[PDB]
Structure 1
Amino acid sequence: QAVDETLTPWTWNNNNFSSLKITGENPGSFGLVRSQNDNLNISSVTKNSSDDNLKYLNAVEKYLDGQQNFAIRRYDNNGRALYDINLAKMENPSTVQRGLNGEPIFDPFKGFGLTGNAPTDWNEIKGKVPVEVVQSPHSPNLYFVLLVPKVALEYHNLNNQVVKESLEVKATQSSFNPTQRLQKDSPVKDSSKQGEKLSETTASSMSSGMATSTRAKALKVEVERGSQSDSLLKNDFAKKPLKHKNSSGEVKLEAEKEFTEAWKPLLTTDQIAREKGMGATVVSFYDAPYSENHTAFGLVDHIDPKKMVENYPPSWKTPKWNHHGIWDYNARNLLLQTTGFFNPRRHPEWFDEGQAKADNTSPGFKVGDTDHKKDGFKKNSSSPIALPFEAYFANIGNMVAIGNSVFIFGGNGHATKMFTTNPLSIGVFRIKYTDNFSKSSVTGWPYAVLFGGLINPQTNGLKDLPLGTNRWFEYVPRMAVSGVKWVGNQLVLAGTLTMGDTATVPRLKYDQLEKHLNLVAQGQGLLREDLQIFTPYGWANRPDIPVGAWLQDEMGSKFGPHYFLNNPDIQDNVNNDTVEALISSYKNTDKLKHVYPYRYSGLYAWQLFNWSNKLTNTPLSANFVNENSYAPNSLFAAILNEDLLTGLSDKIFYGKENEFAENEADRFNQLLSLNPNPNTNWARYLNVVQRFTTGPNLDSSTFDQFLDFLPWIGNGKPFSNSPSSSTPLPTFSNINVGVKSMITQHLNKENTRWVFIPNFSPDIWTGAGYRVQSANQKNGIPFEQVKPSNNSTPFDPNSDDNK
């Protein structure tokens, strides 16, 4: 009961909590304390090879119950300690006694009435450590505290052969080489199946057009259901004339031949839910500083993983699949990438079997059979998204209270992070109170549905960021969370956030992987980097050409009219006479679509502008999503609807409006958006954010000027380099880099004199590494950089394929 000075205050790495300021009728502090003692040899709890983690984790909790003490003492308004609250050891624990209207019986000098019996589950709460505390906004003397197993503190002090990295260090006995782990070999045309390619359009409809050319026509793609019980009648997106290399066996993602001792969670989501001592807990409690009965408990709730995982969107049952399906699945597997939107090869922290399921096989859909009409039907899933131990405690911490409810926004992840493993807050839990605090309820939801209302009007920063989504929640935002607090009248969130994956929106031509090793390694989970890297010489003409269309110029001798390398100078000119042969005739139907004989091309900004999950002016609009980030790659802060966060129902109901297409005939005529069904409620949760921010309130290259202005912390020098002939150059902005010239010779050669710069000369700095005929001829360049395919002469202008 009374104060013990041997326990000292401390800060948890995952939420940085250490004390709560009490406010209103009796001010003061609550704060976390722990025993001061050194020499904590956890490695003395020996782990055998023949058994699972659970009995070891319980032996570590039993060891830590002997080796350390933890408590939550009260202090007065000047910091004098009042009473000790070591929850493992305090005398005569009780819940508070109630009147018939649910109110706790109380009188300030006496304190609360105690029933003389502990709350439910007291035999397994007594081993847990409290890690965050908050107060009711509307009810007097009423408080809430969050508790976890002591391994959620001691995780980095547990022994290294069980708390492993997601990648092995190796013995390096042959000397080190980073290429030995990479699956690298590129696919090839099938020696016995060349003929199943898309058919050329034998005659093309006039559409009141007039012009003609000698070039080959567009390629047909058709899909229709037929009458058969398990097959389509056509399915041209499911063609497979490419196959993987044989190099002492087939190259593919096949986890059991790569991971000889596969990395796995400390516990699975179905263990943490049922082993009630290993799940996190919230309790309500009552306190008064000068009473005889100064403290007693209210009610106990489990922060049960199933109350989060059963509220995941329907597509999270099949993270190896996405709404583009068969062609995108094949194009990713041919490039040796993660299929779907969330598989464990990049993201093992959310899967109960970790690295042991790091493969593209059995995606919840029928694929890889002997016939393209037989592929493309829904079936049983091989691995859903879960909430295992590491991701679970990253989703714990950062509390707030609103009305008759309290919340958990998750931590920064420093409870459970490792140097190759990135667990994060993936959403929010809520605990709610009912029958005048006589009863309670618990729930949680992912940020993927709560952020669904984000639009370009809601930020004063830059526009079109990779934060957009649609009727399928295949974009999966997650955060390291700084906290949630009241900024005057407004409830505000802060932290760092995952965008969509910006590094893999541009996509390779199928054969060239052996000269692009970093760009494939960055997709393989071997390189866990989210920064965009300059690689344009190996990209295809569009990210979205189907795999049946690619094999139309294996020699390169026609410069691949339907599909070729992304060089910007040798794009096909649409002119205006040209369009009738290349696009202005090929009309689509309810079963027919086309791949054009047109050489599309463009650099990194044009790739992202077309195929990134960009924000727009209306919600649920973003039809393209690539993949999800390794780590947080954005700043983030936001204003929340505190009312709507209080008003929303405990249980989210999805429906068939959030399911992927059951077979490919429903994928060909796929509905982009739908109204909520009469029983469903998911659309209510979209609007919990009012406003958000991401950086300085600056527009265009002005933002690169701020990036150059700030000092690098390693030396105190700004990246702009100007505060001291032959002087060095800046890195982010283009000002004073290279030379000035007028843009009057570029592209259309128009408007530049009056609708680009406030001035008579259209000056722009040409930047680092630039092309001109001479230092006098400093404006523009003509089409003089014609390029050969092999040694087979240049691009051949004035030739009948280019006329």
Structure 2
Amino acid sequence: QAVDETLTPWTWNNNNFSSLKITGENPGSFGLVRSQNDNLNISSVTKNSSDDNLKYLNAVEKYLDGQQNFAIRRYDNNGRALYDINLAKMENPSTVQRGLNGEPIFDPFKGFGLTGNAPTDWNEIKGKVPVEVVQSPHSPNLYFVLLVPKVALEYHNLNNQVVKESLEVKATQSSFNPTQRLQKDSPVKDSSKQGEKLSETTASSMSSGMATSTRAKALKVEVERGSQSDSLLKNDFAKKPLKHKNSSGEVKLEAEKEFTEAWKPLLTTDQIAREKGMGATVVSFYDAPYSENHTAFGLVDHIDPKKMVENYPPSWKTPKWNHHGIWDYNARNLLLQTTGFFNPRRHPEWFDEGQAKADNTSPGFKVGDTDHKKDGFKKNSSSPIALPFEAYFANIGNMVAIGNSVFIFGGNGHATKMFTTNPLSIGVFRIKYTDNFSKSSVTGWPYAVLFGGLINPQTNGLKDLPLGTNRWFEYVPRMAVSGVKWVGNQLVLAGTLTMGDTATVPRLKYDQLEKHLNLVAQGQGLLREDLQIFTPYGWANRPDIPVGAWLQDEMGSKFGPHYFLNNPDIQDNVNNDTVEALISSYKNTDKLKHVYPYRYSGLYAWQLFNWSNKLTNTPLSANFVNENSYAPNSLFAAILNEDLLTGLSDKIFYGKENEFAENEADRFNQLLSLNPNPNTNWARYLNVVQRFTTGPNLDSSTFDQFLDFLPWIGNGKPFSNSPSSSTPLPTFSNINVGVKSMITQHLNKENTRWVFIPNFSPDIWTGAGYRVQSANQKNGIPFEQVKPSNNSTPFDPNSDDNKVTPSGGSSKPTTYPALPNSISPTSDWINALTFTNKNNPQRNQLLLRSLLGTIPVLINKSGDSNDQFNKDSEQKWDKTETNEGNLPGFGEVNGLYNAALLHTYGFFGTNTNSTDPKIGFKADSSSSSSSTLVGSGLNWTSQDVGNLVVINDTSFGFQLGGWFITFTDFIRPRTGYLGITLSSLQDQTIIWADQPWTSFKGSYLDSDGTPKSLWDPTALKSLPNSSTTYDTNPTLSPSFQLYQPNKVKAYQTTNTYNKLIEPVDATSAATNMTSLLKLLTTKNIKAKLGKGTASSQGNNNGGGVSQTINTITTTGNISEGLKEETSIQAETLKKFFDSKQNNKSEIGIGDSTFTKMDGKLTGVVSTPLVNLINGQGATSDSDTEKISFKPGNQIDFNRLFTLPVTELFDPNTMFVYDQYVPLLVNLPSGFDQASIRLKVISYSVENQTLGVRLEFKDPQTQQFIPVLNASSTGPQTVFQPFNQ
């Protein structure tokens, strides 16, 4: 039980927690420690055919019991280890001999009363490593230890055959086709159900209608209950004119042949619940640093995923459905995309069957039946959402206790994070305790109900985020945990969570799946990349048009008022006569809703502002929720009500509204609000989030100007590059890009001079990719965006149909005169909210993945000879309207400029490599251009998170990727402050290594006042094999994804982007771009860059400690940067940055200071005086070296009558009065009468024994502390005056 030098301090890569700063009476830390023994034969246990995962992991665990052990080495504020508590090899432990009502009997010296026998389940609990330990400050001297199974500890070393990556590679000795795993065949019209297409209404309802419209007339959509069990009388939604192309058989999503070797968990939710030894556990116990009974135990409690399963909203059981569930279901079928909102196909981590249900059948409702009315009634649901092994293990970590109850807020997933699959914590866990920690109940919640009550007024960051929800909890949050800490007087949760997917919110025209590879893959599930790609040509007029309303104009020459490819160049006016002529007369009742011929349109921004779950000032206000994203693309930091969370009840009951609509008759009249049955407690949990933030408290294009300012660790050069005429342009911010165009000439040309710009001259920068008539006239563009479907002449405005006639016959056109001058991938429009593209999902996701530093690129030419995108004569930045700017306009990630991005990277030029890599994008006009995306070389994944270091009650932070954020102004935001401060990382070898997160070994706050993080360059866990031994074109990595090809039509040399750049059928373009896909692998990327091996030079290994930059309270101030209403905030802060670009320190940008010390760094230990590193640095209270306990020599004793004592202390403050301080402790130095004190701990009237612990005003921290060198035994000492 004594200290064992063999075992060493460490820190697990799920929570990274081995040092709890203990305070109160016995400051120190429950030092978490493991043997530093390497050379562990993982391959010993073989997963044969007969054995299952359960017994295989049992064999692994028992073999490790025979090969490894763990203990918790409690530390003292001095830094002297006392005892370890080895769970495996501790003999005959005991729990506290509590009282009748539950109090623990603890004589300070005789110690906590033992029961002789410890909590049961020794066999299956001694084999669980301690990964975490927490303190309960409400109750006295209570402690927990988080027992996690060790298969997590050795998780990454198990045979890959069982733990299978989601992506399949095999030999694939045929180049590597990123599209050969994507279902690419488009839907087609059926040849047997022609007459069931949605039918145009019989006769328009005049209703005293004075307005007349020459355009096509609306569709009549109604569903009536009638009288039938499994059918109805008329189901207009269930019309399904389209069908899967019969190309080499049906094209459909079905796992049993779309996944030869499918992703699959290890242990199901029920399996882990029933199994005890393989599941986590939290144990209440008690520590006695100065008693012969050093340790005593309380209660042992398991964490049951059955509480997760029972506490999900009923709708979660049927994720393949959704609140819409009928038209959207059919659309997803036909477009070959996500079925539901959280199907396994796009998110298998949480499905206990894994990808085995990566299909469409069995959505909880009747589907596929011939008669359209028949489909829609509920039936068996075989695809529920549960907590499989990986997700459950990600659901453990950073637990904290409040009052009489404890919470486990989830791990971070690295322990079970494989190379591309991203599991994480989905639902919070709660534990309570009854009758003074005598019994407990295990319960857990879904974070969806925790986060349902979100509204923009809460956060000071970016607005309209995809965070809200509706009465159906088809929103699937999941937190990446930085460590919930009791920051000051508020409780803070920080890290990242997965936004509701804002990428696949648009849809694809039925005949446009073979030329939108980018987004079709981004949606189907073969592209786990969560940035958000820009392909505007093929979007629908509304993403939510029922399929039966798609073929009313199949040719598209008439331009399909009900359904047509989105192009707001033609968007109908919102003019009065226009609206009351097109939409009003088609009034919709409860039973019937009118799909209006009106030509809705708009670029991706308007598309999202309509059909994305943007946060509105009222919570529970997200009706259009498409899907939940891939991996955390949202930095997060919120404050969670301690008192409320304590109050909330364990079990959750759901009302009628929680489940889905019984039948489509009811569905047709869905509401966002309904009366919950008062006997249900689910909605109690709603308003728990006080606020939240993801980035600095900035809005609009100014936020992306900040994005421009932030630098890239891969080179350190910021994106702008302006300091030191065909020069690189800013990529994120469009300020000072292109030419200034007038919003006054945009669209209606009316009421715009002082609407979106508070200046006499509304001058804004159209951005890169813009077009204009000519240098003479730039503001606005005449309607030359005319789209001719066939060769039947252009869109034909002013046509009899295209012009409306209100009462009076004054025929007028419904399409606006002058359109905006940018539909670029970086299109920026404050006014044309139907032509802008810089949405807040863009802004936040780019913040996250640019702080990570792994934003993708789009390329034409690799570094190959004769295929080199050289700089001179083919990169003319000043001219970006023509092909000289090399702007693709199709396949690039929305919100940035490809040429500028690649200059920032250094793929061409000296920015990255000594020799120009000769990799870049050309806007070739000779013929069609093939291209794709690739990784950034870096591999800082998104689930990355540090441990939340609480700097003070007003700020905090952690490390994210290679950067160190600090929420400087989140708890107490201040006007004019940027909001956050940043610190970068120095070690290049650490930066570029394969898996740079087998390097961070926990974070803490250094006593000096600035946190740090550990780095172990020798611990870099790269890929298991160098593509075995043969070079595999596809080689996995944290941030490797199937970036599909994008092949585009030829570009017109001049006036390139009048219209959208049409794509060509790129399905079979993979084999012709082998060189381009060679760069899709990070290893090849770094090989080209010249930093593929240790050739980067510099630090040999760089094993040291990195410290974030010191932040003045004014750090991050942009007070002068803002305002200046002479022009817009974006441009004024751009000028501010250009005046302070070379002062990254002031803004909050820097590189963490690094100190090199030799050693096999593995963890840290914490004492309130100072946190020590790796368990070294023994201290002996240097300041108070010359003070010790006075032996019995300086006591009366001798032989006299029973000594009367205890009169010198009172039921008041129990410290001995100042009269008799030095009677027991030697003070040859500290003779001062203003310090040096004592603290009694117990006594006995009839025996006269006195027990005290010294207490003195600590200089460094003005807090009263105990002392160890007082006596060899310890500050606690009995003073018994024997007997006569």
Q: Which category of TM-score, normalised to the shorter sequence, fits these structures?
A: over 0.9
Give the distance between the partners of 2:299 and 2:193, measured in 1 at CA: 67
Q: Distance between the aligned counterparts of 2:397 and 2:197, measured in 1?
A: 54
CA contact (8 A) 1:366 1:378 kept: yes
Contact 1:34 1:71 in 2 (8 A): yes
Distance 1:452 1:756, change over 3 A: closer
The question of whether the paired residues in 2 share the 8 Å contact of 1:502 and 1:531 is answered with: no
CA contact (8 A) 1:141 1:288 kept: no
How far apart, in 2, do the equivalents of 1:710 and 1:260 lie? 43
Cα deviation for residue 655 of structure 1 reads: 2.1
| Partner secondary structure for residue 616 of structure 2 | coil
SS of residue paired to 1:85:
coil
Unpaired stretches in structure 1, ≥5 consecutive residues: none
Equivalent residues of 1:522, 1:528 under 8 A apart: yes
- Structure 2: state its 5+ residue gaps: 802-1282
Measured in 2, the distance between the counterparts of 1:118 and 1:247 equals 67
Question: Alpha-carbon deviation of 1:678?
Answer: 2.7
Structure 1 match to 2:634: 634
Which deviates the most, 315-324 or 168-177? 168-177
Q: More deviation in 171-180 or 236-245?
A: 171-180
Q: CA deviation at 1:561?
A: 2.0
Shift of 1:209: 1.8
**Hey, what's the Cα distance between the residues in 2 that align with 1:549 and 1:742?**
38
In structure 2, what is the equivalent of residue 602 of structure 1? 602
Change (3 A) 1:139 1:150: same
Q: 1:581: Cα distance to partner? A: 4.6
The 3 A distance-change label for structure 1 pair 549 and 55 is same
Quote the Cα distance in structure 2 between the aligned partners of 1:350 and 1:700. 35
- The question of whether the paired residues in 2 share the 8 Å contact of 1:210 and 1:580 is answered with no
Query: Are 1:500 and 1:627, in contact at CA under 8 Å, matched by a contact in 2?
Result: yes
CA drift of 1:67 comes to 1.3
What's the CA shift for 1:227?
A: 1.9
Separation in 1 of the partners of 2:725 and 2:539? Answer: 39
Between 738-747 and 134-143, the greater mean CA deviation after superposition: 738-747
2:163–2:264 Cα contact (<8 Å) kept: no
Distance in 1, Cα, partners of 2:438 & 2:363:
46
CA distance in 2: counterparts of 1:800 and 1:584, whole angstroms: 20
CA distance in 2, matches of 1:697, 1:576: 38
User: 1:212 touches 1:580 (CA, 8 Å); kept in 2?
Assistant: no
What whole-Å deviation, never above 9, does each CA across 1:568-599 have from its counterpart, x for those lacking one? 21223455444455223111223222222222
User: Alpha-carbon deviation of 1:646?
Assistant: 0.7
Residues 735 and 411 of structure 1: CA distance in aligned 2, closer, same or farther (over 3 Å): same
**1:456 CA drift (Å):** 1.1
CA contact (8 A) 2:219 2:594 kept: yes
State whether residues 538 and 566 of structure 2, in contact with CA within 8 Å, keep that contact through their aligned partners in structure 1.
yes
Q: What SS does structure 1 have at the residue aligned with 2:152? A: helix
Partners of 1:754 and 1:610 lie apart in 2 by: 25
TM (norm. structure 2) is 0.61
- SS of the counterpart of 2:428? strand
Contact 2:518 2:533 (C-alpha < 8 Å) held by counterparts: no
- Aligned pairs (5 A) from 1:335-734: 335-573=335-573, 575-579=575-579, 581-734=581-734
Deviation at 1:654, TM superposition (A): 1.1
SS of 1:401's partner is strand
Aligned length: 803
Distance 1:758 1:187, change over 3 A: closer
* Partner Cα separation in structure 2 for residue 450 and residue 758 of structure 1: 40
Does the Cα contact within 8 Å between 1:263 and 1:355 map onto a contact in 2?
A: yes
**Alpha carbons 2:648, 2:685 under 8 Å: kept:** yes
Is the Cα contact below 8 Å between 1:350 and 1:385 reproduced in 2? Answer: yes
Q: Deviations over 1:724-750 (max 9, x none)?
A: 233210011122111224333222334
Q: Residues 743 and 753 of structure 2 are in contact (CA less than 8 Å); yes or no, is this contact kept in structure 1?
A: no
**Alpha-carbon distance in 1 for matches of 2:170, 2:217:** 54
- How far residue 95 of structure 1 moved from its aligned partner, in angstroms, is 1.0
State the alpha-carbon separation in 1 of the partners of residues 516 and 11 from structure 2: 45
- After superposition, the Cα gap between the structure-2 partners of 1:580 and 1:617, relative to the gap in structure 1 and judged at 3 Å, is closer
**Secondary structure of the corresponding residue to residue 711 of structure 1:** coil
Tell me, yes or no, if the aligned pair for 2:740 and 2:779 is still in contact at 8 Å: no
Give the whole-Å Cα distance in 1 for the aligned partners of 2:58 and 2:127: 10
How far off its partner does 1:309 sit? 1.4
8 A contact 1:638–1:691 mirrored in 2: yes
Shift, 1:551, TM fit? 0.8
**In 1, distance between residues paired with 2:702 and 2:546?**
39
Give yes or no for contact 2:308–2:386 (8 Å, CA) kept in 1.
no
For 2:253, what is the secondary structure of its paired residue?
coil
Q: Relative contact order (alpha carbons < 8 A, sep ≥ 6): 1 or 2 greater? A: 1
2:22 counterpart residue number: 22
Taking a change above 3 Å as real, the CA distance of residues 217 and 78 of structure 1, as seen in their structure-2 partners, is: same
Counterpart Cα distance in 1 of 2:47 and 2:612: 47
What do residues 618-674 of structure 1 show as CA deviations (whole Å, max 9, x unaligned)? 121211101001100100001111001111111111121201111111111223212
- SS of residue paired to 1:20: coil
Give every structure 1 segment of 4 or more consecutive aligned residues whose post-TM-superposition deviation is greater than 6 Å: none
SS state of the match for residue 156, structure 2? coil
Is the 1:25–1:140 Cα contact (8 Å) retained in structure 2? no
1:410 Cα shift?
0.7
CA distance in 1, matches of 2:438, 2:759: 73
Q: Deviations over 1:129-168 (max 9, x none)?
A: 1111011112222111110111111100112211221121
CA gap of 1:267–1:223, structure 2 versus 1, over 3 A, is same
Equivalent pair of 1:740/1:765 in contact (CA under 8 Å): yes
SS in structure 2 of the partner of residue 480 of structure 1 = strand
Deviations 1:522-568 (A, max 9, x none): 11221001111111100110011111111111222211121111112
Q: Distance in 1 between matches of 2:567 and 2:775?
A: 25
Distance 2:22 2:214 in 1: 82
Secondary structure in 2 aligned to 1:715? coil
Would the alpha carbon gap of residues 575 and 675 (structure 1) be closer, same or farther in structure 2, given more than 3 Å must change?
closer
> For the residues of structure 1 that align with 2:215 and 2:360, how far apart are their CA atoms?
39
Cα offsets for 1:8-29 (capped at 9, x unmatched): 0001111110111221122111
Moved more, 669-678 or 415-424: 669-678
Q: Is the 8 A contact 2:19 2:30 kept in 1?
A: yes
Percent of aligned pairs with the same amino acid: 100
What is the deviation of 1:755?
4.4
- Report matched runs for 1:31-430 at 5 Å: 31-430=31-430
Please give the alpha-carbon distance, in whole angstroms, between the structure 1 residues aligned to 2:566 and 2:750: 27
Residues 215/740 of structure 1: CA separation in 2 closer, same or farther (3 Å cut): closer
Give the Cα–Cα distance (whole angstroms) in 2 for the partners of residues 65 and 526 of structure 1.
Answer: 40
Flag the 1:754–1:663 CA change in 2: closer, same or farther, 3 A.
Answer: closer
Change (3 A) 1:665 1:25: same
| Stretch moving more, 307-316 or 755-764 | 755-764
Distance 1:106 1:731 in 2: 66
- Cα distance in 2 between the residues matched to 1:215 and 1:640: 54
Q: 2:26, 2:76 within 8 Å by CA — same for their partners in 1? A: no
SS at match of 1:296: strand
- Deviation (angstroms), 1:355: 1.4
The answer to whether the Cα contact below 8 Å between 1:31 and 1:73 also exists between their aligned partners in 2 is yes
Distance 1:558 1:271, change over 3 A: same
- Gap change, CA 1:417 and 1:379, over 3 Å in 2: same
Q: Is the 8 A contact 2:350 2:385 kept in 1?
A: yes
* Farther off after superposition, 432-441 or 640-649: 432-441
When residues 543 and 684 of structure 1 are mapped into structure 2, their CA distance, relative to the original with a 3 A threshold, is: same
Inter-partner Cα distance in structure 2 for 1:735 and 1:263: 45
Taking a change above 3 Å as real, the CA distance of residues 225 and 753 of structure 1, as seen in their structure-2 partners, is closer
TM-score normalised per structure 1: 0.98
Find the aligned partners of 2:368 and 2:281 in 1 and give their Cα distance: 45
Task: After TM superposition, give the deviation of residue 259 of structure 1 in Å.
Answer: 1.7
Please state how far the C-alpha of 1:111 moved relative to its aligned partner.
0.6
* More divergent stretch after superposition (740-749 vs 265-274): 740-749
CA distance in 2: counterparts of 1:213 and 1:706, whole angstroms: 48
CA contact (8 A) 1:26 1:288 kept: no
Checking the alignment, whether the CA contact within 8 Å between 2:399 and 2:484 is kept in structure 1 is yes
- Contact 2:244–2:334 at 8 Å: present in 1 too? yes
Contact 1:282 1:303 in 2 (8 A): yes
**Is the Cα–Cα contact under 8 Å of residues 456 and 615 in structure 2 kept in the other structure?**
yes
Q: Is the 8 A contact 2:53 2:266 kept in 1?
A: yes
Counterpart Cα distance in 1 of 2:96 and 2:318: 46
C-alpha separation between the residues in 2 aligned to 1:86 and 1:683? 44
- Between the aligned partners of 1:455 and 1:667, the Cα distance in structure 2 is 26
